[PDB]
């Protein structure tokens, strides 16, 4: 409720670049804080690459120009090794055009992960169009950059990891371990992959496209009855296993007859610990997930978004409003059924499409939560709701409601489709919120006050 | 200490807004020598005892005035807009704040009512053998519907998948033939209107016999995009204001909103028509619709859906039925052989049941239904909204009660049986002051 909603700072990217599709805090030291903004439709200087996508670095202290692009990869699409001579024709081996690089953006310390969920290649054998996805990892503050495409393997096509789309979702652990979601592995069963920055580096070898990180953790293929589950559609991290190694929270939005479910995996050996089911068919239970302690007891609590949750009005009319489910963790474990639920009020508003912990916004000893409804509001420009944590979890009513100040253009703003909080960039001792709105290629940052 | 007294009505207008059983006195000498003016408002029976004649007790009551009551059709050619299946069609209810107004609603199922049927078929590779027996669906279904109605029009449409990665292979080869070399599969496509509604069942057979099967990658297919277009593209499909049956025939699950994000489709379905040469053009731009969206567009366009799916996917589409009003599910065979009988059984279940829905009401305004069906089964609560087991020519009635608490100006909402164009216009007026 203390967020300076009346005077937020606005960032602007190139038109039609989906600037603000992904947002993140960056701090390679207490001094030199910056805001990262993904723009997966941005054109780049890469030769022969149409709209490769780009990530922007926006240092605090705007004047004159804040944002500039991080050059992860200056090279265009590489050529097929076994076809440069050939008869006639030089075939590209990979396809970086329309790869949506910067669709996902995450950072930890002086490390930056940026993913291209629609990157695809051919393989050095039979011609395919496998969207394996790829990621670029910047470490030690840009002094070296590594490509990481753990789905680009020997196992091609849909039956394998060909359509994995690794990087569709991603996250860092509090120790800097990389965690990727790929919802397309094994005929869209989905998959979670994870490696430490060290393992990725100690096996890096650009000459051979198919890289194999030694010691990589990854879920395995199941029987065909699990096809079309989209495991790894969303991802989060938190401690749920009673140790000091953070665990992997992963959405499986189309699992169990499309009722969907969320799963929690043991952070050490990626084995299953919990399962939580949706309550309505095709509500996309698992569209977004998050983990944070919302009642000040030390134990991280689970949050799940189902933005297509349909409900009935008092006068007997159905309506798509969306809903968010909150499961509290106890010393004994976690109850299979939600502790509380938050429901949207705007039809088609997609309440719960985005979630983020905010930390303790008001310094009242309880962490708070922001929930986005990208099509809420009287003009469907999008809305972000702030909910306060307390003795008994999240409050029923939101403490604050952030709406865009600009007028509604002829296309949606998607305000609140991408969120990120829990970091005090200005250093006033109060956490700050970064709200994206890629619909009009803008990204907003809100600032807390005492 | 009733509510009327313990509300201190300063004037007559206040006394009305607070309690329906209240009345305001205006006769001098009523007041005891030390009363407050907050006492002329009191229970109607109480004022008669305290010493207040009727002439000096204002107590406006809500009334009921019908404005249009065209009678239901009877036996002694008629266009469907001359046929009446519901009455009255318009009335005015004056609402005393706190008091309910009740009026009866007659429904009678018409006889020999026309039918439009659109057959929307999955032409993915998994439906290869199925397309072989639909060669004669046209004439054979035409012949079977003669028993039902003397006026039947049939149409045909097909669908496969969004024409973008990762739902299809994007290599120039697989774009030409999404199957293997053995097959001669046509190129993938979202939705096409093969044939608009018509009576010439001979056209149906020849056109279906000219359709080539297609293909794509993931098992669930994009039939929802097609369902949306069929629903909203009114005049291009040729929907008449009569019974509207959409047959949805597939052997696999369905894509829905959220899945577009895999292929970079973030923009929601707009619920608008986008046909170019009877081809859906914007499958690469708009996401799959959600279920809730389809419920909206199937209802406002009065579509009654028949899901004709295989045994394997019965439980999935059975739950889909529970969420979609006026729809039915039947078990389709491997060669789509029992499709005709499947359609007849589905029809007989949909037509033998009526369900009422009402438009948005203002705050304070509330509604409830009391149904009275054949053989004395009487529904209440939510069951009041519907009557089942209704044969042709059968009549049923609903006692609808509307109550208001708040005091907004003149409101208006419609009550309509799902599937039909005919509706009842309820106009509301609020008694906030004395007359």
């Amino acid at each position: 409720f203390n967020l300076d909603a009346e005077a937020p700072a606005v960032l602007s990217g190139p038109p039609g670049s989906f600037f603000g599709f992904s947002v993140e805090f960056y701090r390679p030291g207490t001094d030199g804080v910056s805001v990262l903004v993904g723009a997966p439709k941005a054109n780049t200087s890469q030769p022969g690459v149409l709209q490769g996508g780009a990530v922007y670095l926006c240092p605090w202290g705007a004047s004159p120009t804040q944002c500039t692009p991080i050059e992860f990869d200056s090279k265009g699409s590489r050529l097929l090794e076994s076809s440069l001579s050939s008869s006639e024709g030089e075939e590209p081996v990979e396809y970086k055009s329309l790869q949506w690089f910067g669709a996902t953006v995450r950072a930890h310390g002086s490390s930056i992960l940026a993913c291209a969920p629609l990157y695809s290649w051919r393989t050095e054998k039979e011609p395919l169009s496998d969207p394996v996805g790829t990621c670029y990892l910047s470490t030690d503050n840009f002094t070296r950059i590594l490509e990481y495409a753990p789905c680009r393997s020997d196992f091609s096509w849909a039956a394998g990891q060909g359509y994995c789309q690794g990087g569709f979702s991603a996250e860092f652990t509090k120790t800097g371990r990389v965690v990727l979601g790929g919802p397309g592995s094994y005929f869209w069963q989905g998959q979670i992959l994870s490696a430490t920055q060290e393992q990725i580096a100690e096996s890096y070898y650009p000459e051979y496209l198919i890289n194999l990180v030694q010691g990589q953790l990854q879920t395995r293929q199941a029987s065909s009855i699990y096809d079309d589950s989209y495991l790894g559609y969303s991802v989060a991290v938190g401690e749920f296993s009673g140790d000091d190694t953070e665990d992997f929270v992963a959405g499986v939005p189309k699992g169990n007859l499309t009722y969907g479910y969320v799963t929690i995996l043991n952070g050490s050996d990626i084995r299953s610990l919990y399962n939580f089911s949706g309550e309505q068919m095709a509500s996309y239970f698992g569209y977004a997930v998050a983990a944070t302690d919302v009642n000040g007891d030390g134990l991280d609590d689970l949050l799940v978004g189902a933005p297509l949750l349909m409900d009935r009005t008092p006068d007997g009319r159905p309506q798509e409003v969306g809903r968010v489910y909150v499961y509290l963790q106890h010393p004994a474990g976690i109850e299979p059924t939600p502790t509380l639920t938050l429901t949207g009020h705007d039809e088609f508003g997609r309440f719960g499409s985005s979630l983020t912990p905010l930390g303790d916004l008001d310094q009242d000893g309880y962490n708070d939560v922001a929930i986005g409804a990208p099509f809420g509001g009287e003009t469907q420009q999008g809305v972000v709701f702030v909910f306060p944590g307390g003795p008994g979890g999240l409050g029923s009513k939101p403490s604050q409601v952030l709406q865009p100040l600009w007028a509604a253009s002829h296309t949606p703003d998607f305000f609140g489709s991408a969120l990120r909080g829990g970091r005090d960039l200005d250093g006033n001792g109060y956490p700050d919120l970064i709200v994206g709105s890629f619909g009009v290629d803008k990204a907003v940052v809100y600032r807390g006050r005492p | 200490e009733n509510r009327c007294l313990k509300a201190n009505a300063k004037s007559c207008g206040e006394c009305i807004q607070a309690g329906p059983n209240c009345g305001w006195c205006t006769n001098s000498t009523f007041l005891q020598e030390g009363m407050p003016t907050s006492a002329r408002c009191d229970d109607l029976e109480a004022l008669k005892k305290k010493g207040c004649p009727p002439d000096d007790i204002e107590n406006p009551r809500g009334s009921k005035d019908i404005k249009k009551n065209k009678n239901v059709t009877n036996r002694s050619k008629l266009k469907p807009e001359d046929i009446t299946q519901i009455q009255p069609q318009q009335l005015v209810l004056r609402l005393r704040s706190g008091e309910p107004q009740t009026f009866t609603l007659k429904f009678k199922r018409a006889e020999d009512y026309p039918i439009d049927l659109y057959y929307l078929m999955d032409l993915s590779y998994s439906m290869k053998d199925d397309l072989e027996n639909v060669k004669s669906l046209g004439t054979d279904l035409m012949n079977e519907m003669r028993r039902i109605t003397s006026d039947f029009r049939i149409g045909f449409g097909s669908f496969v998948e969004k024409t973008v990665m990762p739902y299809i292979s994007t290599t120039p080869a697989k774009l030409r033939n999404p199957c293997t070399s053995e097959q001669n599969c046509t190129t993938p496509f979202s939705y096409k209107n093969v044939l608009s509604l018509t009576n010439k069942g001979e056209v149906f057979n020849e056109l279906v016999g000219k359709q080539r099967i297609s293909g794509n990658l993931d098992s669930p297919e994009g039939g929802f995009d097609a369902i949306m277009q069929v629903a909203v593209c009114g005049s291009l499909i040729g929907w008449r204001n009569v019974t509207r049956l959409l047959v949805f025939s597939t052997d696999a699950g369905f894509h829905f909103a959220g899945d577009g994000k895999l292929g970079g489709i973030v923009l929601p379905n707009d619920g608008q028509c986008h046909l170019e040469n009877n081809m859906y053009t914007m499958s690469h731009y708009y996401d799959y619709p959600s279920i809730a969206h389809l419920v909206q567009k199937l209802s406002e366009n009065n579509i009654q859906t028949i899901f004709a799916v295989t045994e394997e996917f019965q439980p999935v589409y059975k739950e889909l039925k529970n969420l979609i009003p006026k729809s039915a599910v039947g078990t389709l065979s491997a060669n789509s052989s029992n499709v005709i009988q499947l359609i007849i059984d589905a029809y007989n279940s949909l037509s033998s049941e009526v369900i009422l829905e009402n438009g948005k009401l203002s705050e304070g305004v509330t509604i409830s239904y009391k149904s009275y069906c054949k053989n004395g089964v009487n529904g209440t609560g939510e069951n009041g909204r519907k009557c089942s087991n209704i044969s042709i020519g059968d009549e049923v009635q609903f006692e609808i009660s509307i109550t208001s608490n708040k005091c907004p100006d003149s409101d208006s909402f419609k009550i309509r049986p799902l599937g039909f164009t005919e509706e009842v216009e309820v106009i509301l007026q609020y008694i906030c002051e004395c007359e």
Binding site: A158, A159, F187, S224, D227 | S124, Y125, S126, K128, G215, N216, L217, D218, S219, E221, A252
Partner: peptide, 8 residues
Amino acid sequence: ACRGDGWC
């Protein structure tokens, strides 16, 4: 086997 759109 038969997975996806009828891939045996």
